[PDB]
Amino acid sequence: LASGHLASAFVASQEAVTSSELAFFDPSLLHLLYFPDDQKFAIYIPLF
Amino acid sequence: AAAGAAATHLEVARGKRAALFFAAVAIVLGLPLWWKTTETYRASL
Amino acid sequence: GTTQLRATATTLILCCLLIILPCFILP
Amino acid sequence: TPDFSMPYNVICLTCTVVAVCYGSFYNLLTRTFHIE
Amino acid sequence: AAPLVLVLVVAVTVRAALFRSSLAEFISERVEVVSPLSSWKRVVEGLSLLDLGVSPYSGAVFHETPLIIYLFHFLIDYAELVFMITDALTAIALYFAIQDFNKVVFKKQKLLLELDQYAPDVAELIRTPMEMRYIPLKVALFYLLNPYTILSCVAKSTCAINNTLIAFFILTTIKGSAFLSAIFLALATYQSLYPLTLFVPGLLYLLQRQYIPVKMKSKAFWIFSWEYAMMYVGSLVVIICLSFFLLSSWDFIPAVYGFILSVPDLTPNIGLFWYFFAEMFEHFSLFFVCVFQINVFFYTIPLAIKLKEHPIFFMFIQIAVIAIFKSYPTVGDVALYMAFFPVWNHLYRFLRNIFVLTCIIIVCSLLFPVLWHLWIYAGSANSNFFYAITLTFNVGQILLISDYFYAFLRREYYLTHGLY
Amino acid sequence: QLPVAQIIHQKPKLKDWHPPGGFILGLWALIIMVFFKTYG
Ligand SMILES: *NCCOP(=O)(O)OC[C@H]1O[C@H](O[C@@H]2[C@@H](OC[C@H]3O[C@H](O[C@H]4[C@H](O)[C@@H](N)[C@@H](O[C@@H]5[C@@H](O)[C@H](O)[C@@H](O)[C@@H](OC(=O)CCCCCCCCCCCCCCC)[C@H]5OP(=O)(O)OC[C@@H](COCCCCCCCCCCCCCCCCCC)OC(=O)CCC/C=C\C/C=C\C/C=C\C/C=C\CCCCC)O[C@@H]4CO)[C@@H](OP(=O)(O)OCCN)[C@@H](O)[C@@H]3O)O[C@H](COP(=O)(O)OCCN)[C@@H](O)[C@@H]2O)[C@@H](O)[C@@H](O)[C@@H]1O
Numbered sequence: 001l002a003s004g005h006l007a008s009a010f011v012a013s014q015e016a017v018t019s020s021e022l023a024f025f026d027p028s029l030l031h032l033l034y035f036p037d038d039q040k041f042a043i044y045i046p047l048f
Numbered sequence: 049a050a051a052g053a054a055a056t057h058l059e060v061a062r063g064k065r066a067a068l069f070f071a072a073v074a075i076v077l078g079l080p081l082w083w084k085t086t087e088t089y090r091a092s093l
Numbered sequence: 094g095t096t097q098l099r100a101t102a103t104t105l106i107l108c109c110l111l112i113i114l115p116c117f118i119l120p
Numbered sequence: 121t122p123d124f125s126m127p128y129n130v131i132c133l134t135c136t137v138v139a140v141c142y143g144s145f146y147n148l149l150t151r152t153f154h155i156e
Numbered sequence: 157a158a159p160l161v162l163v164l165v166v167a168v169t170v171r172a173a174l175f176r177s178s179l180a181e182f183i184s185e186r187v188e189v190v191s192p193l194s195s196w197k198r199v200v201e202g203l204s205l206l207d208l209g210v211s212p213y214s215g216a217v218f219h220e221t222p223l224i225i226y227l228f229h230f231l232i233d234y235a236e237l238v239f240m241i242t243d244a245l246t247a248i249a250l251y252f253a254i255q256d257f258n259k260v261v262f263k264k265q266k267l268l269l270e271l272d273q274y275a276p277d278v279a280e281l282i283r284t285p286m287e288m289r290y291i292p293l294k295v296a297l298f299y300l301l302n303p304y305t306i307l308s309c310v311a312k313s314t315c316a317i318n319n320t321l322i323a324f325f326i327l328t329t330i331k332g333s334a335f336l337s338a339i340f341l342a343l344a345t346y347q348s349l350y351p352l353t354l355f356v357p358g359l360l361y362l363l364q365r366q367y368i369p370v371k372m373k374s375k376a377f378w379i380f381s382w383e384y385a386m387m388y389v390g391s392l393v394v395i396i397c398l399s400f401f402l403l404s405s406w407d408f409i410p411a412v413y414g415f416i417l418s419v420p421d422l423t424p425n426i427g428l429f430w431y432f433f434a435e436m437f438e439h440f441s442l443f444f445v446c447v448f449q450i451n452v453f454f455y456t457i458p459l460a461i462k463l464k465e466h467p468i469f470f471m472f473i474q475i476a477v478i479a480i481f482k483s484y485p486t487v488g489d490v491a492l493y494m495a496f497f498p499v500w501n502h503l504y505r506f507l508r509n510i511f512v513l514t515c516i517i518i519v520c521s522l523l524f525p526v527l528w529h530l531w532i533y534a535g536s537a538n539s540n541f542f543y544a545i546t547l548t549f550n551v552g553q554i555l556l557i558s559d560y561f562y563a564f565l566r567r568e569y570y571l572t573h574g575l576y
Numbered sequence: 577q578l579p580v581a582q583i584i585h586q587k588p589k590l591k592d593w594h595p596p597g598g599f600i601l602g603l604w605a606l607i608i609m610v611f612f613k614t615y616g
């Protein structure tokens with residue numbers, strides 16, 4: 001866009017949008033529900 | 049006579065080695081394994 | 094109304110820790 | 121079916137059973153006999 | 157010997173009578189007696205699947221090694237005869253192994269008596285040939301007539317075969333035979349992964365028998381240890397590669413070893429892994445399964461440190477630890493280390509808490525079927541009752557094994573320093 | 577909808593499974609090799 005090539009700029013921007021949306025909205029980001037931090041002592045105290 | 053003195057030192061040394069093994073394993077294999085198996089994987093960005 | 098799942102810290106963790114530590118290690 | 125209300129208590133109890141063996145074997149392997 | 161033949165006849169007759177009884181079907185389906193890796197119905201299912209052109213390892217019912225399927229393809233008939241013969245062979249191997257071990261330990265005792273290495277007055281602790289006369293017979297009798305072993309062989313579980321392999325490993329190790337001990341240890345590791353821990357006790361006993369000091373500076377120790385390790389690894393590699401060719405595929409390695417190491421079934425057992433992983437947060441599943449499978453291999457090294465000069469007791473403790481902390485434990489596995497109790501019954505005077513622990517073990521065993529029936533068929537009980545029974549049973553086992561270990565240590569200390 | 581004749585013959589004939597001859601030969605060869613290495 002600084003240089004002046006509008007077609008290449010448009011293609012690059014489209015690829016940027018596609019990649020950013022795929023990265024942000026990946027289902028793999030949400031993997032497990034929250035485990036309470038005030039209940040981990042019940043997980044680590046009894047054995048360790 | 050000297051049999052008891054030769055054996056008790058060996059038993060104390062063996063107990064020391066057993067305690068060292070327990071602590072050293074429970075640290076060296078204990079903590080890295082916990083961190084690797086309970087972490088949330090995060091590739092570099 | 095309802096009940097969420099919460100650990101019984103006083104009831105069981107204390108019991109199952111004082112069944113190990115004073116039985117074996119400290120005394 | 122399992123209990124569905126016993127994940128913390130089962131963890132505590134099974135870990136305690138394992139720690140029983142751990143502590144007993146640790147004492148037997150580490151400590152040595154002494155008089156009085 | 158005549159008493160050994162009489163005991164063998166009595167055991168075979170009892171097993172045959174229970175085979176022809178109406179309780180065979182009841183015993184065959186007990187979760188305490190059979191396991192996902194050892195049930196007979198699963199052997200029959202995996203043999204029937206091969207007739208349909210379906211690989212038996214493509215399903216989730218069959219988890220046995222190719223050697224078992226090859227053995228039971230030819231011997232699908234006479235299965236009860238096969239299992240009775242395996243039990244008798246285990247008894248014979250244990251009998252002769254203990255008989256040779258008694259002579260070896262008496263020679264050692266005579267040596268340190270001649271050298272006057274013991275305390276001035278330990279005559280009560282001194283072992284005599286009269287007290288050791290019937291120890292080999294009692295070893296074979298505590299295994300043949302154990303209710304655990306009788307149930308495990310009437311149910312037609314391959315646990316009996318794996319016990320026979322371990323017993324022959326013990327016999328060959330006690331009678332020199334580094335080659336045969338390595339082959340039998342490789343076969344035992346083939347059926348179940350855990351028996352590989354017995355490598356250290358076997359190596360220690362072989363080194364002691366061959367009179368090689370186990371020292372870091374020593375070179376003969378390193379040479380012999382390398383030969384034994386190479387022999388074991390080669391015998392295991394050859395078995396794996398050979399049994400690959402039975403179905404021309406590697407799918408047996410997952411279905412057996414990944415099953416053993418990852419515990420996918422979660423089916424009730426006398427073990428401690430069934431509920432822990434049924435009632436479990438998926439956040440720490442990998443960490444806790446790693447910890448629990450480390451637990452079995454955890455004690456071999458520290459036990460070798462303390463018990464370097466007592467390898468047979470080390471092997472007995474290791475067998476007990478395997479039977480207790482296995483992923484899929486069985487009363488048949490438990491019965492293998494209770495055959496060693498007559499060997500260590502000279503430690504009785506130093507045994508605390510023997511009556512209570514024996515009573516607890518008996519109570520838990522008798523209470524397994526009752527509470528299992530209440531939970532499953534009656535419906536008036538939960539899985540919590542069975543879980544509590546497993547907890548109490550394993551605690552009793554652990555305390556009994558540690559109690560024998562403590563008695564052994566007490567006897568060694570008294571022999572070295574002086575009994576009052 | 578129900579071609580019985582084709583359904584029967586689409587799957588090849590079922591033969592009882594037997595262990596490979598090469599496998600049994602190799603197993604027996606290993607067993608006799610160990611037997612001779614033990615007995616001399
Ligand atoms: N609009 C408005 C609305 O409303 P509101 O307003 O809000 O309101 C309303 C509400 O409400 C509610 O609430 C809630 C609810 O809930 C509901 C629920 O449901 C369910 O749950 C349930 C369940 O089911 C059940 N099951 C139950 O369970 C339970 C649990 O949970 C709890 O937790 C508990 O209880 C448990 O338990 C426990 O925990 C226990 C533990 C603790 C303790 C431990 C112990 C310790 C130790 C011991 C001792 C020591 C040792 C030493 C000694 C010396 C449970 O219970 P169970 O289960 O029942 O059971 C118990 C147990 C079992 O059992 C056992 C027994 C055992 C057996 C035997 C033993 C052995 C013996 C041995 C022998 C002897 C020996 C001899 C020797 C001698 C000789 C001569 C010398 O379990 C267990 O675990 C146990 C444990 C074990 C331990 C141990 C072992 C044993 C033993 C040892 C000892 C001893 C022995 C030795 C020795 C001796 C001698 C020697 C000398 C030296 O739970 C629940 C109920 O509660 C669920 O759901 P489901 O539906 O199911 O599902 C869903 C999802 N899907 C949940 O979730 C829910 O939540 O409601 C309630 C009520 O209900 P019912 O129905 O009414 O009830 C029923 C009952 N059954 C309430 O409460 C709540 O709150 C809400 O939520 C809502 O709904 C609404 O809305």
Ligand SMILES: CCCCCCCC/C=C\CCCCCCCC(=O)O[C@H](COC(=O)CCCCCCCCCCCCCCC)COP(=O)([O-])OCC[N+](C)(C)C
Nearest residue numbers: 040041044045048074078079082083086087447450451454
């Ligand atoms: C069977 C034999 C087999 C043996 C095999 C052994 C193998 C295993 C051996 C050792 C594995 C060690 C696991 C536990 C280490 C730390 C766990 C922890 O506290 O997490 C805290 C929880 O917060 C709390 O609730 C703490 C309350 C009590 C803490 C218990 C103290 C134990 C510390 C010493 C125990 C022993 C260590 C050294 C001992 C000298 C905070 O952690 P977190 O951030 O919330 O958790 C997120 C996890 N990531 C993301 C950080 C990765």
Ligand SMILES: CCCCCCCC/C=C\CCCCCCCC(=O)O[C@H](COC(=O)CCCCCCCCCCCCCCC)COP(=O)(O)OCCN
Nearest residue numbers: 303304494497498501502504510511514515517518521522
């Ligand atoms: C059939 C389905 C369920 C059946 C459940 C039964 C299974 C139980 C099997 C094994 C449990 C045993 C665990 C502990 C074993 C102890 C080993 C042992 O031999 O220790 C011996 C000690 O023995 C004991 O103290 C235990 C005996 C006390 C309680 C047991 C007896 C009462 C129980 C009977 C109940 C059933 C009766 C029915 C008819 C028999 C040592 O003896 P020794 O050294 O030879 O003495 C001479 C000294 N120089």
Ligand SMILES: CC(C)CCC[C@@H](C)[C@H]1CC[C@H]2[C@@H]3CC=C4C[C@@H](OC(=O)CCC(=O)O)CC[C@]4(C)[C@H]3CC[C@]12C
Nearest residue numbers: 099100101102103104105106107108109125126129512
């Ligand atoms: C041969 C005889 C001596 C056996 C010994 C008996 C013990 C095994 C009993 C006696 C008192 C009992 C305890 C009495 C009270 C409790 C509290 C109880 O916790 C609750 O109040 C329930 C909490 C919940 O439901 O989450 C858990 C069982 C426990 C520890 C019991 C466990 C079993 C005990 C130790």
Ligand SMILES: CC(C)CCC[C@@H](C)[C@H]1CC[C@H]2[C@@H]3CC=C4C[C@@H](OC(=O)CCC(=O)O)CC[C@]4(C)[C@H]3CC[C@]12C
Nearest residue numbers: 227230231233234237238239241242245317320321343
């Ligand atoms: C193979 C090892 C590693 C584990 C299994 C133990 C074997 C050493 C035993 C257990 C069962 C035994 C078999 C039980 C029954 C028979 C049938 C017997 O012949 C018959 O009775 C056949 C009669 C007929 O077919 O008409 C020959 C010995 C044999 C194969 C036995 C050979 C030795 C076996 C395989």
Ligand SMILES: CC(C)CCC[C@@H](C)[C@H]1CC[C@H]2[C@@H]3CC=C4C[C@@H](OC(=O)CCC(=O)O)CC[C@]4(C)[C@H]3CC[C@]12C
Nearest residue numbers: 388389390392393394396397405406407409410411414
């Ligand atoms: C016994 C000790 C001394 C190691 C011996 C190594 C090899 C004899 C074996 C052991 C594990 C085997 C591997 C286990 C698993 C697989 C995956 C398999 O691929 C699959 O079909 C996928 C199976 C799956 O992961 O579910 C191909 C063979 C391979 C590499 C095997 C190749 C042969 C290996 C390396």
Ligand SMILES: CC(C)CCC[C@@H](C)[C@H]1CC[C@H]2[C@@H]3CC=C4C[C@@H](OC(=O)CCC(=O)O)CC[C@]4(C)[C@H]3CC[C@]12C
Nearest residue numbers: 345346349352392396409410412413414415416417418
């Ligand atoms: C005779 C002995 C010495 C063989 C030793 C080899 C085992 C230690 C290996 C061989 C095959 C492995 C298994 C192959 C496949 C799996 C499935 C895997 O679970 C998954 O499906 C996850 C796959 C992924 O993470 O991408 C967990 C590990 C496990 C059980 C592996 C555990 C380790 C095993 C049993």
Ligand SMILES: CC(C)CCC[C@@H](C)[C@H]1CC[C@H]2[C@@H]3CC=C4C[C@@H](OC(=O)CCC(=O)O)CC[C@]4(C)[C@H]3CC[C@]12C
Nearest residue numbers: 349352414417418419433441442445446449450451453
């Ligand atoms: C094979 C011997 C000689 C080494 C000692 C074995 C154990 C001390 C550890 C070492 C690596 C562990 C394995 C590493 C990876 C896995 C995959 C893991 O796969 C899963 O996540 C599915 C099981 C579940 O998550 O519940 C199951 C446990 C397992 C087989 C572990 C079981 C316990 C193992 C075998």
